[PDB]
Design a protein around this ligand. Structure first.
Ligand code: R4E
Ligand code: ZN
Length: 210
């Protein structure tokens, strides 16, 4: 495929800053833990840099196009993605196969500021049937993987909220939380080339002590 994975050391400042973004963006969810499990923090087991020259140049080419359409502003963010297809994504890139057809902002590729939101989709929409081994959406034993991704939003359409195309004149959609005052924003792109899966994070959710 061209993809290689480089392990980061826990002593590396880059490992520490990615872990901190994982841990600090956990919130409680309105489903009481149904989809993603009950936890306040993670046990991070490994963080790997995803290196693929073809996929990177695909991303930067599209970033330059968006930028030039938006007064030299890519509006680039680092955002989480959770999916049963994480292993296809790191080898072949994001495409229409990784879209959420039934999502609140239409058929596109969804990203979260809250790591705990992406965690709800590790084992499928709604958490599917949970981990393959124990059939448990709150499994504390099995190893999970998330992507921390570089995403080009460009001009984003703001949706106040309780593959298709971007709204005309826009490069993405922003789902702004309008009820749960603790929820962070979620974002949708409609072209796989507008994201690069930069870090692969392997972790467990941790059982609260109390
Ligand atoms: C088959 C899995 C496709 C949807 C996965 C998915 C959905 C999703 C969402 N709706 C909002 C915020 C983040 C995510 C995410 O990180 N992943
Ligand atoms: Zn399990």
């Amino acid at each position: 495929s061209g993809t290689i994975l480089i392990d980061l050391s826990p002593d590396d400042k880059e490992f520490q800053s990615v872990e901190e973004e994982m841990q600090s963006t956990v919130r409680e969810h309105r489903d009481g833990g149904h989809a993603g499990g009950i936890f306040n923090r993670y046990n991070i087991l490994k963080i790997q840099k995803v290196c693929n020259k073809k996929l990177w140049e695909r991303y930067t080419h599209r970033r330059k196009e968006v930028s030039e359409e938006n007064h030299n502003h890519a509006n680039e963010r680092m955002l989480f993605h959770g999916s049963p297809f994480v292993n296809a994504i790191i080898h072949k890139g994001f495409d229409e196969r990784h879209a959420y057809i039934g999502g609140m902002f239409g058929a596109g590729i969804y990203f979260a500021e809250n790591s705990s939101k992406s965690n709800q989709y590790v084992y499928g929409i709604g958490g599917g049937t949970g981990c393959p081994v124990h059939k448990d959406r709150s499994c504390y034993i099995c190893h999970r993987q998330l992507l921390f991704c570089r995403v080009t939003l460009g001009k984003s359409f703001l949706q106040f909220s309780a593959m298709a195309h971007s709204p005309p004149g826009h490069h993405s959609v922003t789902g702004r939380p309008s009820v749960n005052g603790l929820a962070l924003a979620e974002y949708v792109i409609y072209r796989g080339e507008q994201a690069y899966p930069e870090y692969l994070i392997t972790y467990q959710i941790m059982r609260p002590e109390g």
